[PDB]
């Protein structure tokens, strides 16, 4: 006897990581002290506008404008895409389970293709939706035949595919998504990690294809993850009813306003990606040195290594924790045999290596 | 043909207000000479540790803490309820949510005593429940016996309950809210507003009902409305449900570190909240003397009003508008009939009662 409903009576929950207020009471250690690199989170933390427009808030007693309308202005300057076709959530994670919440019905089906980002299999469950696993080939690519087949026989409703994939960094090519675009299903493309590689967004696609949506955020890059800023280009068909159906004020105002402030300092956000990618390329060598670990090439701000040799990865993770360093362990069957890596400052680097050279 | 799942396509949107930027556009005017009493906000802001904190937010860049447990020791202490029984949201709007999505099944029941706040009627058609309406009286009390009889008849899942109601402010007593929970029903006390009032909060009545939920804010009496965070105290044979099924991060960093520093001041929540009690009781009275508007008695920041004597009540709120004065106005069938007011300074009540002469 239970108000709860059937399907969420033995939900698996999500395992979310943790901040270095709580890790610091865990681990015996200082924030200061503690090496963080199991998020993606920006060392560097946002551009200094950000903390000075924090600090003068001049309304936060007011609810927030529950159409964002200045950052969506914002957004679509930065990515010359018109803001009708803009949609700002409380993180990307709020327009994942947004999307899911008005297509899925209880029973519908969705694609997924692990190893990925586990967000999309929790949501999935939380929604009461069906998942079909069509999983991605030992270099982490797209199995396009696959997709097309399962799509084919039991008419799923929607595929999120995540460009550079979490959590290896790999990217879909352009042929691959024009292909699934072909599909008669909505296609998530979450580019939580484009700013770290050389291709462009393709948010301008919505525009041609009303079967596209995609997702990005503030959280990576732009060093916002605490604050809950995430963005997306929607076709119009879809927008117009996702707005209606959208909760009004989860967007904060520190949301918006440290968003439009991390977008005043365009060579800010330049600098630091620069400086993570420069650092990704430094970190996979020293990694790839490890006679245990196998790392994949990289277009995020994170390696995904392969732990070999008999060698436990969870216990790596955790030895690795209670010397101070924090890399992501998951435990879902496609990815417990890995560990993930974030890209932090250098001297970050060089702590990981030197708990590395101790374990045992 | 659509994507949107179908009981979505004929989704009647929420109503929302609009912050200072948005109305200094539209109005023409410079916030300071807007008076804005249209939606309980708090004019005194949050105590001064709030401004202090948010400038100096150490790691924007962390996610936030996905189990808030930093406020809700803190939670445990000013409530006396022990902090297992503590969810935090991102308002309680998203409580309300999550309860909704937790519990209620497509074509599931949920009863709604209107007229009330219109967030449950928007919930319920958003996660596809049906509504079984059991108006209040005129005097806007429930009608209990209607209540018992219809959960006999229609055996619904839940009922949402606001105390001091929603728009007019009245209390529910023990003896109807007791009678309540004798039935076979989930039963959400809504105490958005109980720090107006000087009737105890009953979080503490969880640990002996099994089936009542309290949810409470930050965004009235506190003045963070802005910074979305709302609490709540749940039976633990519940919560361990929805702590699964919540999202990981909808709290941020600027939620948990506003509200943690709310509390350590004590003094002044309650001299605002004072000052605000003061200042209804002023209002009232002036209210009531305009010819053509009939005030309630209530126990929040806000009066209700019907507006009598063949004046359109629409056009009354679009006219103080235009003089720079904001009330609430809303279009559903069983609150068009009258206007919101809600409490603000001294000197916003003297431009509301100035506006309201130039229109009589
Ligand atoms: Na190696
Ligand atoms: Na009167």
Redesign the pocket.
Known sequence: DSFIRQHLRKLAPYQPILPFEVLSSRLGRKPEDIVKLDANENPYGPPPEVMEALGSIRFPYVYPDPESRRLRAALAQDSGLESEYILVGCGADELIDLIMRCVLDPGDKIVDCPPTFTMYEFDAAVNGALVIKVPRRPDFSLNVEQIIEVVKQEKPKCIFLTSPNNPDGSIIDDDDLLKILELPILVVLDEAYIEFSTIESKMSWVKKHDNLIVLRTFSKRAGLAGLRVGYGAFPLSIIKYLWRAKQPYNVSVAAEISACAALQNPTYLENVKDALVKERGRLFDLL???????PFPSHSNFILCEVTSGVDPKKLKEDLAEMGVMIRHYSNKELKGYVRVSVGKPEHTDVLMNCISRLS
Chains 1, 2 share one sequence.
């Open positions: 790839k040195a490890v006679p245990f670990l196998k």
